[PDB]
Scaffold this active site. Sequence first.
Site, PDB file in Angstrom:
ATOM      1  N   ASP A 134       0.797  -1.239   0.000  1.00  0.00           N
ATOM      2  CA  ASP A 134       0.000   0.000   0.000  1.00  0.00           C
ATOM      3  C   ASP A 134       0.833   1.295   0.000  1.00  0.00           C
ATOM      4  O   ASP A 134       0.269   2.386   0.045  1.00  0.00           O
ATOM      5  CB  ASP A 134      -1.015   0.010   1.165  1.00  0.00           C
TER       6      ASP A 134
ATOM      7  N   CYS B  52       7.556 -12.890  -0.889  1.00  0.00           N
ATOM      8  CA  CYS B  52       7.050 -12.096   0.231  1.00  0.00           C
ATOM      9  C   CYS B  52       6.573 -13.081   1.305  1.00  0.00           C
ATOM     10  O   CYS B  52       7.219 -14.115   1.503  1.00  0.00           O
ATOM     11  CB  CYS B  52       5.951 -11.159  -0.262  1.00  0.00           C
TER      12      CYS B  52
END
Length: 162
Positions: A72, A99
Amino acid sequence: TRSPAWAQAVDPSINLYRMSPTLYRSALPNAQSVALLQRLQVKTVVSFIKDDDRAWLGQAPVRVLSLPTHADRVDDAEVLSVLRQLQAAEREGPVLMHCKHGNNRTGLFAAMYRIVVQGWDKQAALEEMQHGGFGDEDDMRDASAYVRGADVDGLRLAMANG
């Protein structure tokens, strides 16, 4: 992955897929993933989280490239830097980028690699991202919003001028 150009499954238990002979895509790997990464001849492991991969890599002679981030907050500048670094790492040998869950942060950078590096047409990269079996749409809204918003022409131009 019913399109043959999409990333090919290799080890679903850690969400590991092959994008090319020199580029792989996964979730957080573990100690018992090492043998596989060695068979794939991974020379560099790129992480988009703070976890220290050296903890599970042990003595594997791979380079650790840590680029912890938040989906984000990723901007065009960060993407160019990541893509440049992925590309440079590929020149050294095969690359694993991961990730936590292998579908949001990794899905963002994978998608941007498809678009900027391989010249895919955005919708195409987005379809790989949201429907390639990496996860469901709810898991990756941030990645999706960034990709939808990114200026592909500008990113390509900026990539060439590096």
